[PDB]
Ligand binder design. Structure first.
Ligand code: CO
Ligand code: CO
Ligand code: FE
Ligand code: FE
Lengths: 276, 276
């Protein structure tokens, strides 16, 4: 197989840096009212144009997330504001590559947060691969009518209404070989209830690990590891980062972080090319 | 009737409220540079004067902790400053009750943080009860010559030099009946590597659970639970709080938090009386 892998720019988000890096700047006796910062970071998705079938990793935010008529709760909009030009919308990014949603064979949902699962509803022809624990957690949010937080009720509503084709990765399930040189990594609980990653082996570029929010940024990764404020299972989170580091070493893979502004700037984006 | 329980005031500590309540005041699009605050909370210990032998729960901070010639690293002193008059030192609080360190049969170390294990070195005739995972973690800090953080190298140094008599609670060990109506609760990992609590059954007052830093304050307790910034095992922490809530219900026990300023105010202090 000679795939082409694309990085698609799906806009920017801002939030308290403490969400990204827990206790990044603790107050001290002579600085008792230490103030935080509102950091900007990229939202992106990855398309693997593979001869066996197109694979999409993450889906960014829904185009109708923000605004007075937005799907996101106002509180969510104020804490995690998403800014994106029309060109940044996933459907537009795919269109400019002459890729229709119906062309996508597999969508790998790293997790079901607002900035990763926003456009799942587009892909009614794909198998949606998601960690069973993440799926269960999101569905409970829905059933419990939770309208605030990182799991968007209106998004989940749409997934169900659109009759998406789910394939859950079981808690103790081994890696899934999706296609030649493409493996779904079962990271389990950490940042969220159930994290999935991808290992891609490209002929030219070599190994890539898509970590998503298992590792927010290079600052997260270190060493030393600097865990997030947004966290479910702290032990699991630490285990996963260390696991990724080992895999990266042993397979000579690059690690692509969830939301690293510096790393993202270096990427060849879908408007400039791809990785072979 | 028989046992007398004393609450001993061991001064005050201040720190970033984010340590106490994680993400208490998140930055937003209209408050992007949200500040924290430096909150004050009590450091206290509990003496159970029991017919079978005196039991001490926690030991506060070492008198030699603060100052330019103090045991605590300057970074620690400025992040977690401890203020206490001489009358607040544990040795003095015990003296004012006509209790000598050598009279203490059991010391229960809830964990080995600087504000709980500070005076362990006093009790050379007691059995020191501590969670094995907490003990191991602290000893690693010592062996690794870690001078920063919540584990005080100089304190640990003193414990070893003073040849304390350790009794570790094993990871999967059942609760320990220390004396009639006094049980050591094995909370395991959460806030720290290994947390111990105490359930005390007093003839008159009834059930008391000493939660220590398993539950910082009533705000922590909720519901809903609001976890701390100082945390090791998030899942374990949550499990422990909910366990305490069940035990409290089933045994009709009060829950005494680790560092709740309002609750501590209400307590009958050792200088005014005791519980029976
Ligand atoms: Co996330
Ligand atoms: Co503590
Ligand atoms: Fe994210
Ligand atoms: Fe404490």
């Amino acid at each position: 197989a000679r795939p082409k892998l694309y990085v698609m720019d799906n806009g920017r988000m801002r939030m308290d840096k403490n969400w990204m890096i827990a206790m990044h700047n603790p107050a001290t006796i002579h600085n008792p009212n230490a103030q935080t910062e509102f950091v900007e970071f990229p939202i992106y998705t990855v398309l693997i144009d593979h001869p066996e079938g197109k694979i999409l990793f993450d889906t960014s935010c829904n185009p109708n997330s923000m605004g007075p008529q937005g799907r996101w709760a106002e509180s969510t909009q104020q804490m995690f504001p998403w800014t994106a030009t029309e060109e940044c919308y996933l459907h537009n990014r795919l269109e400019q590559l002459k890729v229709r949603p119906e062309d996508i064979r597999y969508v790998v949902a790293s997790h079901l947060h607002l900035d990763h699962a926003g456009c799942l509803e587009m892909f009614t022809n794909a198998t949606i691969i998601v960690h069973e624990d993440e799926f269960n957690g999101a569905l409970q949010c829905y059933a419990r009518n939770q309208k605030e937080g990182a799991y968007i009720w209106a998004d989940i509503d749409a997934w169900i209404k659109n009759n998406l084709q789910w394939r859950t990765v079981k808690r103790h399930e081994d890696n899934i070989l999706l296609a030649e040189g493409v493996k779904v990594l079962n990271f389990g609980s950490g940042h969220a209830w159930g994290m999935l990653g991808l290992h891609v082996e490209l002929p030219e570029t070599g190994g890539i690990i898509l970590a998503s929010d298992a590792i927010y940024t290079a600052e997260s990764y270190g060493p030393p590891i600097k865990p997030p404020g947004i966290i479910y299972d702290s032990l699991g989170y630490m285990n996963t980062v260390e696991r990724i580091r080992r895999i990266a070493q042993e397979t000579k893979s690059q690690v692509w972080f969830g939301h690293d502004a510096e790393q993202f700037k270096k990427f060849r984006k879908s408007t400039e090319g791809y990785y072979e």
